[PDB]
Design a protein around this ligand. Sequence first.
Ligand SMILES: COC(=O)N1CCN(Cc2cccc(NC(=O)Nc3ccc(C)nc3)c2F)CC1
Ligand SMILES: Nc1ncnc2c1ncn2[C@@H]1O[C@H](COP(=O)(O)OP(=O)(O)O)[C@@H](O)[C@H]1O
Ligand code: VO4
Ligand SMILES: [Mg+2]
Lengths: 768, 155
Amino acid sequence: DAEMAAFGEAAPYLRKSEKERLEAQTRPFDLKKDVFVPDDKEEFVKATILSREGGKVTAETEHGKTVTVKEDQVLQQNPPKFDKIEDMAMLTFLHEPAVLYNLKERYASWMIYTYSGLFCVTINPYKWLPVYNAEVVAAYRGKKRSEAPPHIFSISDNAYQYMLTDRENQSILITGESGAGKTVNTKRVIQYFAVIAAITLEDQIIQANPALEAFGNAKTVRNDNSSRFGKFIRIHFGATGKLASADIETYLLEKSRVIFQLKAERDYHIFYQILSNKKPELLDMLLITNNPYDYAFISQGETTVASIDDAEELMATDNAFDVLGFTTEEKNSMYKLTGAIMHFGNMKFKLKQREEQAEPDGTEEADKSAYLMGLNSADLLKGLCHPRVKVGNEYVTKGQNVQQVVYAKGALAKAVYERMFNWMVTRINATLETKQPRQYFIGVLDIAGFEIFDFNSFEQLCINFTNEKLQQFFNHHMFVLEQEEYKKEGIEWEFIDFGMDLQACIDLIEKPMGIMSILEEECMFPKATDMTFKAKLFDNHLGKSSNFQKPRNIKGKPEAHFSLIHYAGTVDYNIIGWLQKNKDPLNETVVDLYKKSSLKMLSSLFAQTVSALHRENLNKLMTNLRSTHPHFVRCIIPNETKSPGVIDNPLVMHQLRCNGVLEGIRICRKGFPNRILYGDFRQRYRILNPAAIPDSRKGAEKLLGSLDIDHNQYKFGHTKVFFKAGLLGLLEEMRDERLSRIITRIQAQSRGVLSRMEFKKLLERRDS
Amino acid sequence: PSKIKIEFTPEQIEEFKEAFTLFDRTPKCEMKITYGQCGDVLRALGQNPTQAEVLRVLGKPKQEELNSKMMDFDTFLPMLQHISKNTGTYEDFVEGLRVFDKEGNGTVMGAELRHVLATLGEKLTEDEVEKLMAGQEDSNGCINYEAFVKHIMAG
Ligand SMILES: COC(=O)N1CCN(Cc2cccc(NC(=O)Nc3ccc(C)nc3)c2F)CC1
Ligand SMILES: Nc1ncnc2c1ncn2[C@@H]1O[C@H](COP(=O)(O)OP(=O)(O)O)[C@@H](O)[C@H]1O
Ligand code: VO4
Ligand SMILES: [Mg+2]
């Protein structure tokens, strides 16, 4: 417990007491009786064998039920020394209920992080725990994986040590479905490096997220604070490991949310933060009321969230902008454009008497919009109703009905908002860039997670396709590149097929003739419709692509056109408006007015397809990631009701299965997950036995051969020494132990010198 | 204590008897030392024992015994003989300091080595570190750790 003293009040939430360790260790247990059996409702249950009879077992479950099962369905419980184990790669029996019950038992003690080989699993507590303070940050600094309990700070510290030891860029890839904990863990990685460096760039990196979340996050049916954009945060370091700079890359903000909401969701936080009336001057400046129901674009779903204090959050947003060095003019322009968007959606239109042409139906909301936008309202209204076309020194007008104007009005508001969000990211990067020299970076990936709504459209396909690719990146790193490394290096290895490959689903979406390629081609045919697109998908894929199926339409649920078998589940997609969403067209007459705006921000914001741009961002991200050493954090949703400390076994089992957690632990156990170049081995471990190295390969052989170790736990490659993670942990303990003994011996020689210096002074007074 | 056969020549014994006398701080000038100054005399006489090795030959004394238990030369001599029997090579010392060499350039930051000697192993006081480190840093405040190892081993 004294060894856990540095962690303070966080200590019981990170590691169990020595008293609990002795209680577990000695608890009643029989290796023969204490087993796990399958269960139709709970996946697996703990059971005690009562009788063994002709290949079948009769056992009593934890729920007081007598079940009869086959011997090959029975799985052994790990002895009590393994209770709440920190690394599941260390369990004697590795199977699904062993992993599930180890996770459940740690979660019941509020221990939300568990190592699983070289990666980590985290389960959403739905509760604040005192494990993320500056004292816990200090306590994790430089700790080896064995000496420190599992935490997001230790994954962050390990990545930093790999960076300096291997001299290579690192990535922290945080997976999970919507509401699993990716954004929370991303901000904890950032917090770790900011607080370590603090012991204003550090303040600025922490304040980047509240500013982005006001404009890029929103309440969805799955998450009260859902990220509606992807982001890759790079934390730059000098050659010796000092924090140097940071930068943020953002991907595909969900544009439709700005002007549209489904029943159980809100628009972006910022609108409600402003309307909170916490800063009444903002309402006066934006010429708005305090009622969200007065603004069409923002009040189609929900307007309040029980867990969010929009008044408190506007102060967090406004303070984030101050810390980030945004001027009053920059802050006010962002508020004004948000208010202008609110007014813009309230502009009504009617058909002319004798022609299918739109005309303004009142001009009050257009006047307010134009005023905030630095435009003339008559020019705005004429541009929307009669967009100009150039024909030999004349701007002839194109006719527009009310449907066309309403659509154009929406497209424009979505564009202003998206470009404003992109301006803000560029502006955050301008302050985060310090011009300080660097060599390395640790990148943190925070994507929008796997989601299934009652209505799934183009935005859900793009999101779910990102999650599919990220899962495949894990599969590739863990099971493909890993086995390839062994073979290239000449390590004796038999290829294992882990059954983790999502290529058929990925190909269906992104390859030629696939979903995106068909959509892109249809966007190039002027006469194409949502039903010519729907027919083309069916003709090319129904009965041909395993992952493409018919929709599973249910009465009281919205209509879908097809279903896609994703890694995390089958999703029913609605195809209406996908051509328009992909082309994303804009009224160029109004864009010219934005270019000539008296409001400098709108003027600068405006100074082929979404699927093509998405595909390009993804594969360019996947190649940045390929040049880094990835570290995975697998965030898990425990239940469907946001209940703290409650686990739903099938839901947790489903997530662990499709994440490939067990297969991932297996390759770490069976393979050699740690490796070091021969020259680098000599520099780090010659200290263990300098006499053994008085050729770098021969030296490594002689040194490792002289140690009292399991000689099966290391292998010699063409250029590297390979290790089991357990042997590396032991070698590191041996290195620290020997360093301590050497320092003690240097100190003894140092005491010798100091005493001899004093003795020489004493002799000089009498004898010398 | 009794099992220790004294191997030193009578001339060495007289040489050690004088060094031991130079450490006398007794008010009556009785030519005795406290248990706590034994380490110092073993060191003045060419030995380099650890704090633990000194405490073992002293018979594991309490802090009270180190401060005020007196020792004569006849009790000291078998302790000097026993300590002289039992150190680490130049290579071990250089490898130990290389751990703190971030770049692998042959130097270590002065303030870092000072911190290591005052925190790790059998901690040296800030005063002992100051005295030992005096005039050993270059113009950039760095320490050539293999030159430093040669310096302490020749001391
Ligand atoms: C167990 O304790 C820890 O977690 N650590 C102890 C100190 N370690 C430093 C260190 C020693 C030996 C080798 C490496 N490098 C290595 O394994 N590289 C590697 C392995 C796999 C892939 C995909 N890419 C690169 C290395 F950094 C790292 C932290
Ligand atoms: N480690 C955690 N500690 C406390 N609450 C958490 C933790 N992880 C998630 N939560 C809760 O769950 C919510 C959803 O988490 P979040 O990181 O936004 O999910 P996502 O994976 O969608 O980005 C958080 O806003 C918070 O209320
Ligand atoms: O709810 V999420 O942040 O995964 O989008
Ligand atoms: Mg998020």
